[PDB]
């Protein structure tokens with residue numbers, strides 16, 4: 001009978017001005033896109049979302065009057081923002097670019113009743129609160145990571161996770177496609193990596209890998225949901241799958257057995273063998289050809305078997321290879337202490353218990369111009385248990401309930417780091433313990449939207465007490481969408 005309030009959206013929109021009567025979507029509603037082919041793709045995506053639960057035809061049309069209009073226009077919304085106007089006559093989403101229209105659609109779906117997400121016809125009514133939202137993002141780096149190395153996830157399961165992150169306006173998908181327990185991408189020049197290095201996973205199950213066509217399909221689908229794919233080939237540590245596949249990559253020339261455990265820090269590429277850099281060049285060159293995004297993530301975490309000076313020598317030689325293939329380096333924050341090249345970004349995954357000296361090394365790099373991606377392990381690691389009783393996940397970084405994950409400020413977080421060095425945030429989901437897509441959802445939700453809100457919303461909107469009510473408001477939508485989630489006692493679920 002009553003619309004959801006115009007402000008009950010995550011991320012919190014930059015500006016919300018409620019007023020006037022709601023729009024009611026009915027069988028006469030059309031989706032109008034004018035003559036833009038870019039807007040027509042967004043219109044078709046919206047019609048796909050709405051047709052099952054409404055049962056309405058919802059034709060996507062160039063001309064029309066009233067109804068839902070998606071309009072590309074010059075305006076003050078940048079590359080990702082939009083304005084959404086709703087009243088008795090219709091709803092109009094205006095933006096500079098298709099990504100902004102797409103973000104406005106993600107808001108519109110949160111404004112609609114939870115039953116709109118159902119996959120068969122529902123009664124409605126389909127109300128959208130009256131007023132105007134004007135919305136633009138705080139940070140440009142708003143990313144979610146999936147580890148498909150520890151347990152492998154199929155192309156369709158990666159698409160499903162893309163659809164989860166698209167709900168909350170993430171714009172980057174970091175795929176961790178190599179580790180000790182699996183190598184997940186076909187490399188034509190090193191064909192044993194995928195067939196043998198991809199042949200298993202944590203726990204000894206059958207593993208799998210993406211053919212180049214599978215990977216292209218993941219990239220294409222991600223782009224259709226306005227996610228830029230950031231692939232990671234972790235080096236020089238976390239390389240057992242590669243080392244097990246090619247004896248010659250090992251310092252002693254002996255291939256180790258495939259690894260199906262969960263320990264870390266034991267593996268290393270051979271920093272002083274020429275073949276090591278031919279291998280990296282070949283692999284990063286093939287990956288670049290599949291990567292229309294700007295970045296290649298070279299990892300750099302837990303190289304505990306690589307002495308410091310060898311780690312530095314290795315990264316000095318590898319960073320220029322990323323440049324050669326026309327991309328920007330991203331590494332885990334161990335790179336900060338190993339001469340990051342100009343323009344390289346580092347991903348901070350430390351926690352409150354990380355040494356002060358280690359924090360200061362990252363802060364010094366930031367002060368020196370190195371951009372920071374924040375993903376603290378005791379804040380935004382979605383594989384981290386909520387409490388001691390969580391049946392999945394890890395607790396190496398302690399326990400991370402919903403409020404802990406949300407309630408901090410990226411601009412005022414790492415001591416000594418300039419706020420302008422912070423490019424944004426990431427919510428990584430590591431998979432030592434997760435082996436099916438429902439377990440992924442149970443650990444991703446309900447913290448995933450909170451990290452998206454950190455990336456997107458203005459600092460002035462940040463407030464746990466009001467955010468938790470917006471978060472409780474998502475639960476019926478997730479139930480209609482088939483998403484399992486942790487029902488935290490911190491959140492006032494209805």
Ligand SMILES: CC1=[NH+][C@H]2[C@@H](O1)O[C@H](CO)[C@@H](O)[C@@H]2O
Nearest residue numbers: 264301302332349383394430
């Ligand atoms: C960057 C980073 N290195 C470690 C750490 O994060 O924790 C993950 C599990 O939470 C683990 O899988 C990974 O090897």
